[model samples]
Target: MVLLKEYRVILPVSVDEYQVGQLYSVAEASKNETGGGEGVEVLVNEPYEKDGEKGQYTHKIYHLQSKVPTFVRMLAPEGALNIHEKAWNAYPYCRTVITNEYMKEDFLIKIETWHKPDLGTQENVHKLEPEAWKHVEAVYIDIADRSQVLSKDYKAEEDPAKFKSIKTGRGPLGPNWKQELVNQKDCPYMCAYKLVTVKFKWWGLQNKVENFIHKQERRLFTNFHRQLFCWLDKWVDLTMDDIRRMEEETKRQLDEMRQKDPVKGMTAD
Candidate 1:
């Protein structure tokens, strides 16, 4: 049941849609809905944090009843560890991650009338266990938790030591951490900078691991990560020309408003 997936992905989303530790399920993204397109919700089995590391896991996944015979718990960590390895991937990185798992009695009752195939009756079922379905949970899971790093002095450095390494020991995650891992540099013009890395491991789900690793691994990673950052850059990334355009636009709007004002220089009436 041990499944390990190592990935490095880059993705971007709008500045407004990013959330840390919030679980999103397998559902299509659409505008304006009660569920907000989040189907069966997954809660944290346990919440954990240690300086640069933080994780949330849940055993019970709601709204998934009638679809599967059993439920699963997932626990995935965000951010980097103390080993100078970054927890996030420059806001555009995607990775394979394992979530800690759970079960609920109410879940069984909800799906009691649902189809429950008798494993004994099906010879093909013998090859798998109830926990096998859990492996699919991590397959579509996307992690977008990196703090957006955009600046002038924020120089990108190379650090293989930080590659695929998850743990905390010293400060400033490395191969190439420039002084502080989180750079808050001031930029006079518009520019963009990003880097991403991810590692995913699942215990108890093993058979399909190789298939995913070999086939869908890079495909999903690259697509998800790249698209994410692409969207982010569309709005956030800028240049001197962009800034000038914005400034000119703003000035024009302000001038129009000033001219339209009924009271321009009317003193104490």
Candidate 2:
């Protein structure tokens, strides 16, 4: 017997009705059944029956597994992972994204996608060795107990250098960084000032490397570098009326936008 491991996915439990034979429509109700929020009795695998070879799986459960991609454990079963039956039938590939947290004992990962078949559904049933219909323990199986799958050559190696994060050597992140990198010049003799720095020559070369080498490599991929700033060593003096009118126009534009009024040729830059 062979089994496989997949990144498990779970849907936030849902419930719909089945009156007579047709699926029932569920209404919103309080989580505690108070009718204030949302609620539904998660009917595990209700209409299920002995299914598949040797009656290993429930008929309803089997179809649910095949049609919908969800997590159903040995405990009281959870709900199905259906985007929408009607829409799905119309366009079999119809997909929608959903955001939720799916967890197994040791791994809890937040996932945000739905209805996307190219991702959620694995149509290749051939990957299921010895058929997915067969039963096995729900928890991780040990090689010592039974031969369910392949064997591994377990050997270990060690690396002397630990370099996991690429972000480690970069400058500050986000909007204010370029100005902040320049401001460090003010207190260079201070102890804390020396601790923080913009390695100008090194950083400039990094941008060149990134623009050419890394960009060309990954086809990839942030933060700080200096902008060329020159002091007003020489002067272009403005006339008094010119400065006054310039300030007036600037003030008028600011007032317009702050008041929710748009004037021609004026906008918040």
Q: What would the per-residue lDDT of candidate 2 be over residues 230-251, giving only the tens digit for each residue? A: 1011111224344334434443
lDDT of 1 by residue, 1-269 (tens): 23322222211222223322111101111100112111222222244444665543223222211111121212213211111111222222222222223212111110000011111122222133446433422222222222222122122221122222123122223323322323533211111111111223345433433343333333433333323332332323344344435434443443343334232110110
Q: What Cα-based lDDT does every candidate model obtain?
A: 0.25, 0.19
Please report the candidate that would top lDDT against the real structure. 1
The worst-scoring run of ten residues by lDDT in candidate 1 lies at 106-115
Model 2: residue 259 alpha-carbon error in angstroms = 38
Per-candidate TM-scores read 0.25, 0.14
The local lDDT score (0 to 100) that residue 258 gets in candidate 1 is 30
Backbone clashes (count) for model 2: 9
